[PDB]
Design a protein around this ligand. Structure first.
Ligand SMILES: Nc1ncnc2c1ncn2[C@@H]1O[C@H](COP(=O)(O)OP(=O)(O)OC[C@H]2O[C@@H](O)[C@H](O)[C@@H]2O)[C@@H](O)[C@H]1O
Length: 162
């Protein structure tokens, strides 16, 4: 039946229309800047016992609504090699949680492309790991970003696969 899809939206992920949200989290469950700022603004109870290791994800239910805290590596602290593995792992744990949760859709940002980027442009790296994990799930995936140029590039990368 229903065709699982990938979409990109340039808007605040906290305003998503999907059955769940992925927070670009930190490992201590602390409020922060960027995605986590918006997620904390809307779902602060989701931060109750959300602390989890780098490269893992941990879901906290806000009623019927899952907030998947996914912890990408900070590339200021991780080497390129070790960070690539942790980033891959975070997105794989996202896919496992999404499947487990039985959700029909998910709102997701590009992990480790903002305050955890170590100053590097990691759009293509983060998206590649996103695809590698998500591709085997049948949930509709909606990627959120804030930059116009990044929206275009993410959109192209989706479109050219098919
Ligand atoms: N409200 C938002 N909606 C959509 N996209 C956003 C939003 N805020 C930021 N972005 C974009 O989402 C991407 C992820 O950036 P971050 O949220 O900074 O996540 P990350 O790079 O994984 O760093 C996580 C760290 O940031 C802290 O705020 C958080 O507590 C953790 O310490 C970046 O490309 C960023 O430009």
């Amino acid at each position: 039946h229903h065709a699982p899809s990938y979409r990109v939206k340039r808007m605040d992920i906290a305003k998503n229309d999907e059955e769940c949200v992925v927070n670009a989290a930190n490992p201590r469950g602390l409020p922060g800047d960027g995605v986590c700022k918006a997620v904390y603004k809307k779902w602060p109870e989701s931060f109750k016992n959300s602390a989890t290791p780098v490269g893992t994800a941990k879901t906290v239910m806000c009623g019927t609504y899952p907030v998947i805290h996914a912890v990408g590596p900070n590339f200021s602290n991780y080497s390129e090699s070790e960070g690539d593995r942790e980033l891959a792992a975070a997105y794989r744990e996202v896919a496992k949680e999404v499947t487990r949760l039985g959700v029909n859709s998910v709102a997701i940002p590009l992990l480790s492309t903002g305050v955890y980027s170590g100053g590097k442009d990691r759009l293509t790296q983060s998206l590649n790991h996103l695809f590698t994990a998500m591709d085997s799930t049948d949930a509709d995936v909606v990627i959120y970003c804030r930059d116009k140029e990044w929206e275009k590039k993410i959109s192209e990368a989706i479109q050219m696969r098919t």
